[PDB]
Enzyme design. Structure first.
Site, mmCIF file in Angstrom:
data_model
loop_
_atom_site.group_PDB
_atom_site.id
_atom_site.type_symbol
_atom_site.label_atom_id
_atom_site.label_comp_id
_atom_site.label_asym_id
_atom_site.label_seq_id
_atom_site.Cartn_x
_atom_site.Cartn_y
_atom_site.Cartn_z
ATOM 1 N N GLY A 23 0.793 -1.196 0.000
ATOM 2 C CA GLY A 23 0.000 0.000 0.000
ATOM 3 C C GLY A 23 0.832 1.254 0.000
ATOM 4 N NE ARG A 24 -1.436 5.036 -2.645
ATOM 5 C CZ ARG A 24 -2.258 6.089 -2.802
ATOM 6 N NH1 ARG A 24 -2.897 6.647 -1.766
ATOM 7 N NH2 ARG A 24 -2.450 6.595 -4.021
ATOM 8 N N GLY A 25 2.818 3.273 2.739
ATOM 9 C CA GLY A 25 3.453 3.421 4.052
ATOM 10 C C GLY A 25 4.195 4.747 4.168
ATOM 11 C CE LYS A 48 7.726 3.442 4.055
ATOM 12 N NZ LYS A 48 7.558 4.379 5.295
ATOM 13 C CG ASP A 146 0.072 4.665 15.911
ATOM 14 O OD1 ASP A 146 -0.829 4.514 16.756
ATOM 15 O OD2 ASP A 146 -0.153 4.624 14.687
ATOM 16 N NE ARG A 150 -3.131 2.338 14.037
ATOM 17 C CZ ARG A 150 -3.764 2.504 15.205
ATOM 18 N NH1 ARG A 150 -4.787 1.715 15.528
ATOM 19 N NH2 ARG A 150 -3.377 3.459 16.055
ATOM 20 C CG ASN A 151 1.092 0.743 13.733
ATOM 21 O OD1 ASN A 151 0.868 0.698 12.529
ATOM 22 N ND2 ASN A 151 0.710 1.774 14.502
ATOM 23 C CG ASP A 164 11.473 -0.966 13.222
ATOM 24 O OD1 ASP A 164 10.824 -1.439 12.212
ATOM 25 O OD2 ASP A 164 12.740 -1.186 13.418
HETATM 26 C C1 LIG Z 1 0.613 -9.795 3.106
HETATM 27 O O1 LIG Z 1 1.379 -8.935 3.964
HETATM 28 C C2 LIG Z 1 0.887 -7.817 4.585
HETATM 29 C C3 LIG Z 1 -0.453 -7.405 4.448
HETATM 30 C C4 LIG Z 1 -0.914 -6.244 5.068
HETATM 31 C C5 LIG Z 1 -0.072 -5.484 5.870
HETATM 32 S S1 LIG Z 1 -0.691 -4.155 6.621
HETATM 33 O O2 LIG Z 1 -1.874 -4.632 7.262
HETATM 34 O O3 LIG Z 1 0.235 -3.675 7.571
HETATM 35 N N1 LIG Z 1 -0.916 -2.961 5.593
HETATM 36 C C6 LIG Z 1 0.253 -2.492 4.849
HETATM 37 C C7 LIG Z 1 0.045 -1.118 4.214
HETATM 38 C C8 LIG Z 1 1.315 -0.476 3.656
HETATM 39 C C9 LIG Z 1 0.670 0.073 4.922
HETATM 40 C C10 LIG Z 1 1.265 -5.929 6.014
HETATM 41 C C11 LIG Z 1 1.763 -7.085 5.371
HETATM 42 N N2 LIG Z 1 3.101 -7.491 5.413
HETATM 43 C C12 LIG Z 1 4.161 -6.647 5.493
HETATM 44 N N3 LIG Z 1 5.465 -7.047 5.611
HETATM 45 C C13 LIG Z 1 6.148 -5.875 5.748
HETATM 46 C C14 LIG Z 1 5.236 -4.820 5.744
HETATM 47 C C15 LIG Z 1 5.399 -3.369 5.772
HETATM 48 C C16 LIG Z 1 4.274 -2.568 5.995
HETATM 49 C C17 LIG Z 1 4.388 -1.193 5.948
HETATM 50 C C18 LIG Z 1 5.606 -0.580 5.671
HETATM 51 C C19 LIG Z 1 6.728 -1.388 5.393
HETATM 52 C C20 LIG Z 1 8.052 -0.779 5.056
HETATM 53 C C21 LIG Z 1 8.820 -1.304 4.020
HETATM 54 C C22 LIG Z 1 10.072 -0.735 3.767
HETATM 55 C C23 LIG Z 1 10.516 0.360 4.514
HETATM 56 N N4 LIG Z 1 9.766 0.854 5.506
HETATM 57 C C24 LIG Z 1 8.557 0.315 5.779
HETATM 58 C C25 LIG Z 1 6.611 -2.779 5.412
HETATM 59 O O4 LIG Z 1 3.991 -5.312 5.531
#
Ligand SMILES: COc1ccc(S(=O)(=O)NCC2CC2)cc1Nc1ncc(-c2cccc(-c3cccnc3)c2)o1
Length: 266
Positions: A23-25, A48, A146, A150-151, A164
């Site tokens: 998604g959008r992180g 990301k 936070d 959800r995190n 993190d």
């Molecule tokens: C099928 O897998 C998933 C399904 C749903 C989620 S989620 O429910 O967390 N939604 C993600 C959305 C982007 C905000 C997480 C994961 N798995 C996952 N694995 C890693 C991460 C993640 C989620 C958000 C940000 C980053 C990220 C990646 C690189 C650098 N900094 C941050 C990584 O998410």
């Protein structure tokens, strides 16, 4: 001012295969990375990547340097690599947690829970792992701000990891004094525990979150026990929600205590 050791962290763009968006992180995508841990394996990772204002480049590069500074722990979402050299997008590569976030996951198991399928062992274990992750973050002199189900992400073999990189989760002193400290994260952790033992419910069910909610909170009103709690786990929530931040347990004390509850459960 923080360094970037490319020898240690830089990963070739040509060994990353773009996959499904998360998604959008910053756009977050799944990718397949060959050799990211130096072995001859293909591994799914989370990337990301930058779409590009200097502000956005700076924010992502700062994220990268903070993840490096923090370092490794099992119960946080770890940095695996980055693509920073000119000639392609800026990318930050972290561990992929295939089951997604803990809130959505526990909700999906509401009819797949028995106390002794998820069991009490699983919930106490998730709780214990988060406390260990937070104890680690505190030792690196971080505050999360936070800390919420959800995190937390769920990866294989019931490993949970704190992302993190939210009024119902905020300590009264943060609401009223703007203060975020590690002890205010202990308060949030209590809300997260309630989230875990409600199997992914929303905190303060059917309560308008307004000036009166904040009033009752300063005054000592707390959430009732969630449906899947043990008495000890609700006691722990109440402890975390102590009005005096200094009377809340520390993360180290929670890791000890939850470790004992985990062992007592078995
Ligand atoms: C099928 O897998 C998933 C399904 C749903 C989620 S989620 O429910 O967390 N939604 C993600 C959305 C982007 C905000 C997480 C994961 N798995 C996952 N694995 C890693 C991460 C993640 C989620 C958000 C940000 C980053 C990220 C990646 C690189 C650098 N900094 C941050 C990584 O998410």
């Amino acid at each position: 001012r923080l360094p970037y050791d490319a020898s240690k962290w830089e990963f070739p763009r040509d060994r990353l295969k773009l996959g499904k968006p998360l998604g959008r992180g910053g756009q977050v995508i799944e990718a397949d990375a060959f050799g990211i841990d130096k072995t001859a394996t293909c591994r799914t990772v989370a990337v990301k990547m930058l779409k590009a204002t200097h502000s956005e480049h700076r924010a992502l590069m700062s994220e990268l340097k903070i993840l490096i500074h923090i370092g490794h722990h099992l119960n946080v979402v770890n940095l695996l690599g980055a693509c920073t050299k000119p000639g392609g997008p800026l990318m930050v590569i972290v561990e992929f947690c295939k089951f997604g976030n803990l809130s959505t996951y526990l909700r999906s198991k509401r009819n797949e829970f028995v106390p002794y399928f998820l069991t009490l062992e699983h919930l106490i274990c998730y709780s214990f792992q988060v406390a260990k992750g937070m104890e680690f973050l505190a030792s690196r002199k971080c505050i999360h701000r936070d800390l919420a189900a959800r995190n937390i992400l769920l990866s294989e073999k019931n490993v949970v990891k704190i992302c993190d990189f939210p009024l119902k989760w905020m300590a009264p002193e943060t609401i009223f004094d703007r203060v975020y400290t590690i002890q205010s994260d202990v308060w949030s952790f209590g809300v997260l525990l309630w989230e875990i033992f409600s199997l992914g419910a929303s905190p303060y069910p059917g309560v308008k979150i307004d000036e009166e909610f904040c009033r009752r909170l300063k005054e000592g009103t707390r959430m009732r026990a969630p449906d899947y709690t043990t008495p000890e786990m609700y006691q722990t929530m109440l402890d975390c929600w102590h009005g005096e931040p200094s009377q809340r347990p520390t993360f180290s004390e929670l890791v000890e205590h939850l470790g004992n509850l985990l062992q007592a459960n078995a």
